[model samples]
Target: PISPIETVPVKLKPGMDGPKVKQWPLTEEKIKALVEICTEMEKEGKISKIGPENPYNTPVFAIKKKDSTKWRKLVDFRELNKRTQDFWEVQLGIPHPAGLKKNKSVTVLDVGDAYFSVPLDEDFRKYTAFTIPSINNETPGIRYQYNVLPQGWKGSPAIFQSSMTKILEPFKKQNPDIVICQYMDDLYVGSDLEIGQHRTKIEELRQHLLRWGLTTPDKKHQKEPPFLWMGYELHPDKWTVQPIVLPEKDSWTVNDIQKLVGKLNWASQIYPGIKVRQLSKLLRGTKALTEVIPLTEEAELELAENREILKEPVHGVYYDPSKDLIAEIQKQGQGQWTYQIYQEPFKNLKTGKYARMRGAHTNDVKQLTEAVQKITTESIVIWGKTPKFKLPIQKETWETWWTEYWQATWIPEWEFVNTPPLVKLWYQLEKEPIVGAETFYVDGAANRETKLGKAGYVTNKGRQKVVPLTNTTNQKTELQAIYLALQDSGLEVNIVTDSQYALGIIQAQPDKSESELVNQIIEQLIKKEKVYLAWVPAHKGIGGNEQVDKL
Candidate 1:
């Protein structure tokens, strides 16, 4: 029967004649099965004999079913599909994982021979032709083209979805409460109502399917659902993916990696917290997909490590509006703003909380902030680490963005921490060494009797200099030594000195100092970024400090 909706024609790009492919080799049993399929298809009016003039041809092959006794037929439309224009308009909306509600009864239905229900546009049927390979040199192969929608045609799913959606619209409106989601030919009918209550709705759906000459097999009309749908098993409490079937053999090709990684990639969506360090290593060098390659020693160990990890099922995190949400925003590799959102299953922070909700290390400041803040009222909004929000961008830039873009209440949620965005109190680096390109140890001494001061410093990398200072106190000479060591040092200056007073003046602020030379030392300290400052005792046996002392 012709579909009520407008049927889309196969629109090919302007090129040579339609693409063609020869039949692949098949076993004698399969070849006989294929011939029988072709004959039955013609008699059943699903396919028709095509003339030799039809240039377009697609290969048909059989894949063995898990049962081993049956073969599933498939058409290879790759070359022909490549030459076709945009035939996919409306995509089949596969229901999101969130659609499966807890305590709700679920049933899935798959259309029986659904694609065959569609009649191909008469003019383009020739493009879907296939050849039946001959048994021997004496027998010539026969060509047949589909009258119905071809199974492997790129346009088949779109056209079928369009038809199916249109067909189910009246049924949907009548049973508006019934949750119906279509993924290609499969339908997920569910409701928070009792399981058997929807059996009548399912029956009505069968009547609607009858209108399009569509039907669902009894086996596929699954009433029970803790059953596997898509890749996940729909459970009452949580949806978890089926356990991974890891392989034993170690050596792999890019294709083998692809198969395992594809499964792991999907599981990562469910278990967002699972670290991908080892998984990422497995994928690094696999540029060519089908060639055999050996894994590095680390990769082999990682594969073994992942084998253990894959055995565990990932219990996907679900969003609960009542619970507090935690957003961990941090700087990613090479400077990208990444924010991870987690549902704090346990809001009690006295003991650490695990991020249970859907969190992603997603990018973009404006959109990401706006989105997080909108949902953050019910959440414990963490811009970054509690003490300091990690800024992938400059601190000043992030503050400006927070002020300009996200002008929302409690934007300064961490009031004492960084609350007043720009107003910060005391900054300290108690004992942390400075991050610098080069480091220099400095010292200063004064002959208290004559007040003849000397400033000295030595680079551990090998250099020393001492300058005599006239009319100077010990403090002045110490400040002079700091200034000398830092003045010409490369970016990220690391300074170690035995003067606490001079170090305090430099760190507290250069402007606060009364001494002119001390002020210059602080100025030099401020000139470079990430200046690491440390104080050493005068009599201490520290090699660098003691060496600079004698300089």
Candidate 2:
């Protein structure tokens, strides 16, 4: 069965009827485009022509997206925007280009019609009603309503992000080694693995996305560098990220200078405390934004430095895990600092020397302590490097154990294995096929140092998990995963595992059973009509096996 999207109704702030909206203006040609848009949306159950009895009315309009000729349709949802509430907590992380692994290859795919695919609640539809301007005499001034999540609605981004994440959550678990970063609709799938295998992974991802009715419409998607993504040219081969903006001048205005500042601020993300001091000189004089102004001699120098700063091969973010991080102090007491992540340890130019890279900053030792611990959870839980933390002396001489709040999540998960690798006679270059198998790939992993582990299973019919374990043996964990899978497998099913020892315990004759876990697994197999078990080499490119291991 195809997966269903999260169907939670949009939450609005109390009982409030929104203000009336004026219909947006459109030319004859634009109206022609609007009609085409409405016609298609109507057929696809995204929008509907309705009567004028609805109390709320919002305006819909067509506008162009960056470098795209097609009219990106949207509703002026300010009325609704003001009335919505945040209902989600799991904020999806959009890894900055700076945070993305360096030297890894990237493959990009854009979700077709990103937000519109998510259906809205029927009751919420009345609040989302709008008008499609009358097209001559053929189509009257018909009122319309959105059937799906509308563009420009404030809640759409979080809602869309939550939907996409849930749909791909299992895939992320199954392929923990292959990082997929989704910014709303566009996905940047990155891997430090081989090219042919990476290409195969993309196709598998396309099929998973297709199941939820999400389409990747671009035919000429790039597999490597020169990726024009989110306003930066990602040249992976050259190992450079050039900020791609060609700022021009004619009748220069304050707004243009503001835009240039915004562009520079983006590159400044990897460079801390880098708001060019003189650029503000261009911004201070203009009373009105559109008022034309002369580029001052000082302004000219500031602009030239930026041109050198932003042009091709301008700057690159190099995230080498096997490196060092130094957190230098700038100020204190109720502070604010940006995360200047990755690339080099610092930045340089005639403009100035700036601190560049890894992490954030906050006000004082209390927050400085709390803030550091909070985000460090990412490095601990995510990249699996848990740094031992410290607390500062408070001004009030009173403190809270909020470090427990931050430290508690990832500290225990830090595991150690001291076993050295044995010299191999030869490497086995074999793998299980990633094809039609009704497989429940189960795996059990235990850390000898911590005596902590997990057992999990993944199946094609949308069944999977990584249930946690503590103070357990590796042998029992494998048997535990098999026991878990058999409880779900109905009658006749072939389940796969990497534990030959566990399988042998059941198949071979043994006197007294050493494990109650084994006894339960044996009982569960006997309770079923039939259960076929097969053992395969673990950690080889066997799709679900890798997934279950990570899970």
Tens digits of per-residue lDDT for model 1, 189-299: 876667567677777787788777777778664576566676667665556667767666657865566566656665554443334465556656415433466777776
Clashing pairs in 2: 318-343, 335-363, 340-357
Q: Which digits, one per residue and each the tens of the lDDT, describe model 2 over residues 212-266?
A: 8777776525785677665456666333444456477766776567667766766
- Reference-based lDDT, residue 58, model 1: 83
Model 2 residue 366 CA deviation (Å) reads 17
| Cα RMSD, each candidate | 13.4, 26.7
Deviation (Å) of 546 in candidate 1: 34
Q: After superposition, how far is residue 37 of candidate 2 from its true place, in Å?
A: 2.0
Error of 1 at 318 (Å): 6.0
lDDT of 1 at 456: 86
